[PDB]
Structure formats: structure tokens, C-alpha cells
Amino acid sequence: GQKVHPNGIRLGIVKPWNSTWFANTKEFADNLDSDFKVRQYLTKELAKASVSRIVIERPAKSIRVTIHTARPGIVIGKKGEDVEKLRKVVADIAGVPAQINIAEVRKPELDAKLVADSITSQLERRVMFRRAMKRAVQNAMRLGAKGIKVEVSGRLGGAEIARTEWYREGRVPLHTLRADIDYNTSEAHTTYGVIGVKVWIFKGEI
Amino acid sequence: ATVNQLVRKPRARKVAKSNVPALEACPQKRGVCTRVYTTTPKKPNSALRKVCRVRLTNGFEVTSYIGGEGHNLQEHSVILIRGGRVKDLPGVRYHTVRGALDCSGVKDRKQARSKYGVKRPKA
């Protein structure tokens, strides 16, 4: 009956930031404003292998962009011509340069997010994804974790249908600010209305 | 849960209570139009519905509903009788399939097909 972030409340304790930067008194507004826009652009570039962690550092307002994706080799490009492009279009909004750094998602099966991006991809096939939903969780759980609970709310049937389903492939200590746990999301549609999946990945105890 | 109160109405929504007294033979019959009425103030403001009485030999007096469209259902006629006492009607315990004789019933209602017996329109 509660949804409860383990993440965000505990930045220094095994759960690092989505952004760590410093603006004084007057200079905060356009930084923050750009912090939605460069994020917007990056994820629609990355979606061909998603983005697990989207890490906006700002060493001097100018932006040390640090992007965890499953396949770097497609945003590197045929070697360097999309790394030019990105660094242009993420500096442009900010008015200041943006140093596009990659990282590789170290096996998508174990991740802070990519368990939700696997299940929400299936809703683009439009057929009965249920055949593949418990499966695609249990696969990723043979390659990592100790428990996971998964929730789907959305338009998942026909004509006027909106209902919500819940599933438990292991136990979940719900908040514990010491544990290795991750909370996260991802969002789909199916020509009728939203399908928004959420996760609690009890990876390990401490 | 005190069954004498509880049984009266409790959770069904068709609620089976129907009161259909009298027998003396069979329900599916011929019924003479005897004497017309349109009298009696009620809550359903029943308009143009001439609800008449029938000379059925059954141990008390009884009445019938007009059973379908077509305004002339005169006092000299003799139609067919059948069950279906809608909540609307006090006293009555039947309705009528009334296009026998000269009383006609459905006029040019193309939609009526197998429900009353009408022919095709312009395909």
C-alpha cells in the first residue's frame, strides 16, 4: 500500500546520483532548465540499447555527460561521427561545452533499470506479451539478484480495459538504506493507453 | 440474516416476486374487448393507452394491456392474450399480440421483422 523509494533518500550509500553539480545564489535557473532538455535528447538517441544511468556532472557549468548504455559501439558510431553530433546538440541548449563520456551497462540482466526496458519493449509486438514478461524477469534473475517484485499498471487488454497486476519472483525488504536494492520504472503504450512497469530489485543484503 | 425480514428483497435484481393469480384452464387465450377504459389517476401518467376489461370466466373480474403500437383497439374486437405484467400496470395480469381482425397494430415500422411479422423494405 506504499510505493517507497529505496533510491534518492540515500545518495552516498551504494546508490550514486543522476546529477552532481554546483550553482550559487543567482546562477541555478538555466542549469536546472537544461537538465531536463539534454536528458530528453540523450534518451531518444540511446533507446536502441537504452540508458541505465544518465549522469550529468558540470565541472564549470559546461557538462561532463556520463552515459551508461548496453551498446556504446552505436553512439560512438562507425568511430567518432555521432560523438561529434551529441557534443554539439547537448552543448547548444546549455550555451557551454558538453564532454560526452560513455560507459557500458555491465550485463543488462543485473542492472538498476534495464529489467524494466526489456519488459516494456514487448508491448510494441502488440500480441500477448504475458508469454514473455514473467520469463524475461526470471531469465535476468538467473544472471544476478536474490529477490525482485514487479508491478504493471496500464491498458493491457482491449476496448475499455484498464487494470493492474503484481508479481514476486523473490522476497523484498522494502526500503532498507543499507541494502543493494534498486527501485525504478519504464513506460510503454499499445494504441489504447499507457503500460507503465515498476520494479523493486532486491539484489543483495548489504 | 433474520430470514423473515431478509427473504423479502435481499440482493437479486430481477427480484422473482410477480403475483399471477387465477387459472381455470390455460394462459394463452382469446379475449373479447367487453368495455373500454382510460380512467384512473396514477403516478405513471399513462397517455392514450386505452386499458380495457375482458369477460374471462375465472372466478373474479380481470383486465388486459394493449400489448403493442397502433391506436385503434376498439371495444367490439377479440385478440390474443399472454403473460408479461410490467411494473407500470396495477390490476392487469396480461398483455396482447394485437394485429388480428381490423386492429392492425404495427404501421410501416420496417424494424419490427420477426418480433411482429413484417415484410422487407428497399434493400
Binding site: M128, L156, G158 | -
Partner: protein, 205 residues
């Protein structure tokens, strides 16, 4: 009166590799199973314990093309008969006239073969029995008549069945086109993928 089509609409619910149209291009690539054959509810349909036998009466009713008439009038005597539901019923629909001629290859589709047999192009030992519920019992014979015996459609069957599994339960000639059932069909090798007892248990519900 046996339904006529849209014939590939029957495949889009009766399922894969049906006889009704065996032969060319449509098979798999337009009967839309694994794609999404019923697009609107495709997201999360269901079944029923009774419904799943119902689609298998439907299998038998549409793959062989017989009326609700015949389903009752073959079951009528199947309470007198001595074997399983698969013998008593499903075998007969595999060896009624309009079906056995398809099986030997006198037509290319299991919906064409009925039209053929009502057109007086086939006989039973001489009998031009267009009454195509008439069922052809073992070691006595079914032939295309003279003036229809190699007639285009026949060779579009016989040159196309050549690459496929021909059953042993029946035997034919492919160059003068006549034959019979050499034994009774057997619920093992009858090659219909159906659970052959569902279609009489469906009466018990």
C-alpha cells in the same frame, strides 16, 4: 450450404497447416498466427476449459467442411459403434467421399474436393454419389470419371503431393487416378494433430 469462405479467415482461427488450402503461397505468411490474427484483443486474450474443446469441434467442422447437421447424424450411430471417439467420428470425416478424393490428390484443396464430388467428376465403383457424406469403406473403390481424369486441377494436386507425406491407410494410381482405403484409419497415424476425443466429451461439458 457449407460456409464457402472467406476461406483463409477459417485459418486465422482454426490455426496452422490446415488441408483446406494446403497448396500455395498463403500458408503461414497470411494466416497471421504469431503475428496477431485478432489485433484488438491480441494484447491479453483468454480461453476456457469448454471453449478449448469448442475450437476443436470447429477444427473438425471447418477443416473437412461439414454442417451441424452431419456432426449430429455421424454421432447418432456412434453410440451403436464399438471403438473410440476418434474411430466412431473423426475417421469418417477423413474418408467421406469429398475428403478421400483430396487425400489421394484428385483435388488440391480440401474445400475444392467437395465442389468436384458434387459436380459428377468422381464415382464410387460406378456410383456418381454426389451425396458426399457417403463413406468409402476398405478395399472397394473411388475413381475420377473418364472425361475428368487428368483435367488440370488433378495434376496441380498430384505433382504437388509428390514432395509431401502420402499416407499408407489408402493407395492410389497417379497416372490413371483411381484407389481405395487399404485398411481402417488409426488414431496414432491419422496425422490430424487433434485430440480426437474432445468432440464427444463436449456433449458432457
Amino acid at each position: 450450404a457449407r460456409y464457402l469462405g472467406p476461406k483463409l479467415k477459417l485459418s486465422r482461427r482454426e490455426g496452422t497447416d490446415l488441408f483446406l488450402k494446403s497448396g500455395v503461397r498463403a500458408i503461414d505468411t497470411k494466416c497471421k498466427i504469431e503475428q496477431a490474427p485478432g489485433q484488438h484483443g491480441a494484447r491479453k486474450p483468454r480461453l476456457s476449459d469448454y471453449g478449448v474443446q469448442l475450437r476443436e469441434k470447429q477444427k473438425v467442422r471447418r477443416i473437412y467442411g461439414v454442417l451441424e447437421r452431419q456432426f449430429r447424424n455421424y454421432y447418432k450411430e456412434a453410440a451403436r459403434l464399438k471403438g473410440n471417439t476418434g474411430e466412431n467420428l473423426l475417421a469418417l470425416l477423413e474418408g467421406r467421399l469429398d475428403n478421400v478424393v483430396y487425400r489421394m490428390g484428385f483435388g488440391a484443396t480440401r474445400a475444392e474436393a467437395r465442389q468436384l464430388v458434387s459436380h459428377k467428376a468422381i464415382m464410387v465403383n460406378g456410383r456418381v454419389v454426389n451425396i458426399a457424406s457417403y463413406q468409402v469403406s476398405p478395399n472397394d473403390v473411388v475413381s475420377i470419371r473418364e472425361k475428368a481424369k487428368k483435367q488440370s486441377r488433378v495434376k496441380a494436386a498430384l505433382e504437388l503431393a509428390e514432395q509431401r507425406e502420402k499416407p499408407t491407410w489408402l493407395e492410389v494410381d497417379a497416372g490413371k487416378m483411381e484407389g481405395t482405403f487399404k485398411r481402417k484409419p488409426e488414431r496414432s497415424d491419422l496425422s490430424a494433430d487433434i485430440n480426437e476425443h474432445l468432440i464427444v466429451e463436449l456433449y458432457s461439458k
